[PDB]
C-alpha cells in the first residue's frame, strides 16, 4: 500500500474561521475505518474537536476556537499525521457584520438524490441576510478529485452555481461565508446515473 493515500481531510476549518462560530471540515477514509482516526488541536484555546460519522466512509469534523489566532489541526492515522497534517488555520475575531448562519443554499445540485452524470447540476446561494463576507466553495468527489463549480454573482446577493459531475459517485460540496461553514453544508450528493 505504498501507492495509495488512505485518508483525506479538506474544508474551511483546515484553513480559517471565526471566534464563536464552528470551524468545519470533512475527512474521507478509504483504507482504514473512520473511527480509526484521531484529532488534536494546538492553539490559543482548548477548542474541543468533534468527529461525526456519516456512515459512508466519511465524517463531518468540527471544532470551536474561542480565541483568535493560529491553530494546528492534526489528523492522525495509526499515530502518524496524514499527508498534509498538520494544517495551520488562522481563526479571526468575529466581525460584527458577518452572519454565516443566515446564508441559505439550495437547488437540485445540492440534493442527496437526482443528479446525473454529464448533465448540469445547478444551485443557488442566497446571502442577502448574511452581511459582509467572502464566498468560498470547497468541493471534491469520493475519488478525491476537485470539482470545479461555476459561481456567478447575480449582483443582488444571490449566486448561480453549477457543475457537471463526471462519474456516478458521491460529490461533496462545502460552502463558506466569511470563512465559516454554512448551515446544511457540507452537501453530500449522489450523482447517480
Least distance CB 83 / K ion (angstroms): 8
Please, which residue, 53 or 84, has the CB nearer to K ion? 84
Please, which residue, 87 or 138, has the CB nearer to K ion? 87
Q: What share of the chain is helix, strand, coil (3-state, %, to 5)?
A: 5, 50, 45
Kindly state the DSSP code that residue 146 receives in the 8-state scheme.
B
CA distance 25 to 127: 21
| Binding residue count for K ion, defined by CB under 5 A | 2
Please, which residue, 140 or 190, has the CB nearer to K ion? 140
Least distance CB 41 / K ion (angstroms): 14
CA distance 29 to 49: 18
Told to check if 134 binds K ion by CB under 5 A, we report no
Please, which residue, 84 or 134, has the CB nearer to K ion? 84
CA distance 13 to 27: 11
Least distance CB 141 / K ion (angstroms): 21
Other residues' Cβ atoms within 10 Å of the Cβ of residue 88: 13
Please, which residue, 138 or 159, has the CB nearer to K ion? 138
Task: Return the C-alpha cell found at 147.
Answer: 470539482
Which of these, 104, 171, 182, lies nearest to 139 by C-alpha position? 171
Q: Is 184 left (phi over 0), alpha (psi -120 to 50) or beta?
A: left
CA distance 149 to 142: 16
Least distance CB 37 / K ion (angstroms): 16
- Going from the C-alpha of 47 to that of each of 2, 13, 40, 115, the distances in angstroms are 34, 12, 9, 37
Q: Which of residues 27-86 bind K ion (CB under 5 A)?
A: 84
Residue whose C-beta lies closest to K ion: 84
Least distance CB 27 / K ion (angstroms): 14
Least distance CB 184 / K ion (angstroms): 27
Please, which residue, 43 or 100, has the CB nearer to K ion? 43
Query: By the criterion CB under 5 A, which residues form the site for K ion?
Result: 84, 87
Amino acid at each position: 500500500q505504498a501507492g495509495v493515500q488512505k485518508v483525506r481531510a479538506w474544508g474551511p476549518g483546515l484553513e480559517t474561521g471565526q471566534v464563536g462560530k464552528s470551524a468545519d471540515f470533512v475527512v474521507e477514509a478509504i483504507g482504514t475505518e473512520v473511527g480509526t482516526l484521531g484529532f488534536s488541536i494546538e492553539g490559543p484555546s482548548q477548542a474541543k474537536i468533534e468527529c461525526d460519522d456519516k456512515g459512508d466512509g466519511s465524517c463531518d469534523v468540527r471544532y470551536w476556537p474561542t480565541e483568535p489566532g493560529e491553530y494546528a489541526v492534526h489528523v492522525i492515522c495509526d499515530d502518524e499525521d496524514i499527508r498534509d497534517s498538520p494544517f495551520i488555520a488562522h481563526i479571526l475575531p468575529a466581525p460584527p457584520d458577518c452572519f454565516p448562519d443566515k446564508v441559505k443554499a439550495f437547488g437540485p445540485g445540492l440534493e442527496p438524490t437526482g443528479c446525473i452524470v454529464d448533465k448540469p447540476a445547478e444551485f443557488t446561494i442566497d446571502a442577502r441576510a448574511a452581511g459582509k463576507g467572502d464566498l468560498k466553495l470547497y468541493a471534491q468527489d469520493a475519488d478525491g478529485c476537485p470539482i470545479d463549480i461555476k459561481v456567478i454573482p447575480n449582483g443582488d446577493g444571490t449566486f448561480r452555481c453549477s457543475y457537471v459531475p463526471t462519474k456516478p459517485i458521491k460529490h461533496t460540496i462545502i460552502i463558506s461565508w466569511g470563512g465559516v461553514n454554512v448551515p446544511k453544508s457540507p452537501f453530500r450528493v449522489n450523482v447517480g446515473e
